[model samples]
Target: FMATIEEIKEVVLKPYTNHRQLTIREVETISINLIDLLITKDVKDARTMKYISRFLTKQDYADLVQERNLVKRCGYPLCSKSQARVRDPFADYAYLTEYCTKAHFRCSQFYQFQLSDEALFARVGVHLDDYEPPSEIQLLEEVLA
Candidate 1:
């Protein structure tokens, strides 16, 4: 809760440097460790946003977005294109990417919004199976086209 990002990164990565190379699993664990350390009192701090941002169902949304940069895929749920272009869709984001097309970027951003909102409810004890998340309707609200 008290450690800064640099200190967190150092402590988390320190364990891995000894190994010299890490795969999805190792980086995955490191990322998990990161969130565990970046304690936010539900204040929606940088760490909190990062957690939600990387939380897309397929979210290997790994700040794995920030970690290991080789051959990373688009953050879009359906799009798996390896990335080159990036933009901060949200404000004060520590790290983010990731769609190959602007449309995918927009699509993912809103979809993420919907799903994260659903997850928000789930955190407070909503029954996930009984709950229905808006899919196309919400995306249309985002694109309006």
Candidate 2:
């Protein structure tokens, strides 16, 4: 599933406090401020900052699971006995699904621009799945006007 600011904070900071002996409240406040910056601005800086926070949370969360021996750590066999099973209860496929659907949507939305010159370059719009390609391509020697 896609992560929200609060979830990222909880997953990222919990491990640090347990190992380094720090206050939970401080980490929570820091996480909130980071999320605020991401949601309140549309500039490149805001997006970059949000990505940095996301990277931190994901990396730390993986380390936490490995350290705690949760869910068999993803790749190892189930047990020493025979007939070991592979378990992955924490796997979240929603992110992959949502990403693919959104990409397809964007691909269909990139056809609003129109070119006006025809003498030098053909005005054939090679998009619109229902439309056929135009046959009147201008000579390459003609100047665009």
Candidate 3:
């Protein structure tokens, strides 16, 4: 039931050190291998997914504000823009930009939340859909290359 984040770090993120140079078949093979490993252990997979989801979703972000903790530090330039700008009615009424406000954004946000939550539920030992790779994989691959 207990698994450490370090363990998952070693398993999922570490093996991709040379993935960019790898051919498509190799990437697919490694992905399949990863799914197999996660399916077998389960707990580590769930824990990893849960931790990242919670971090990104700001689910407990309120606690930081409560504790007078800094959520994100702003540099002078960053703060300058923020300070200079008046609150846009459009900003709070919707997402900060068209990119953020689009249905695609909402769909993707919901999609990721669902996927991560589902993976986390499975990690806690509930069975549902099998593991599927996240879109982040491709993003990582692009960046790595």
Candidate 4:
């Protein structure tokens, strides 16, 4: 009915085999080494290193996905299209594409971020037959901390 990451990363590594790619481990190692050296060294150097290392993956990953189109769905709300007709979301866009469409994305942004009463009625149309809201008491406990 929904999606998951363990299910997702399954296919992302099947096609690429080049140095143009950013290695997740290599990137993290330098970031960690930067902080270790900087903490034992200069603060500005640490930040500067992060900027460079971050950009390495930033651009590498960006280059990879700029035109990536694959089998994915929006899977918003119930996250299985059963609750909102969303898909499993695009396997490539990663976090940026949990919803299949703009409207589905918008409603879930309202739902997941904790909508207030007026927005609930106004935006979501506020239903409760098969559709329901967070438990009032449960929300109270969560609302605090």
User: What TM-score fits each model?
Assistant: 0.34, 0.23, 0.28, 0.21
Which residues of candidate 1, in runs, are more than 4 Å off? Answer: 1-71, 85-97, 115-128, 132-137, 140-145
Better of 2 and 4 by lDDT: 4
Model 2 lDDT per residue over 1-145, tens place: 2334344345443444333333446544544544443333221322222333222243332232233233322111111111122335787533222112333222212210111223211212211113243322221111221
User: Among all windows of ten consecutive residues in candidate 2, which has the lowest summed lDDT?
Assistant: 74-83
lDDT of 4 by residue, 23-73 (tens): 556444433443333222222322232222222222332222221212232
Number of clashes in model 2? 0
Higher-ranked by lDDT: 2 or 3 = 3
Q: Which of candidates 1 and 4 reaches a greater TM-score?
A: 1
lDDT by residue (1-145, candidate 3, tens digit) is 3234565446544654533344555444543444433333333343354543322223322221112112221111001111122235576533222122233234324424443333222232111122333444111111222
How would you encode candidate 1's per-residue C-alpha lDDT over 22-141 as one tens digit per residue?
555765575466544432212123343332332233343433333322345554433345444544357562223454556655665555544443222123212121323333234423
Best lDDT among the predictions, by candidate number: 1
Off by over 4 Å in 2: 1-22, 43-51, 54-101, 104-145
Q: What are the RMSD figures for all models against the true structure?
A: 15.0, 22.5, 15.8, 20.3
- Candidate with more favorable, higher TM-score: 1 or 2: 1
lDDT scores in order: 0.41, 0.29, 0.32, 0.30
- Rank by lDDT, descending? 1, 3, 4, 2
* Poorly placed runs, candidate 4 (over 4 Å): 1-71, 79-96, 115-145
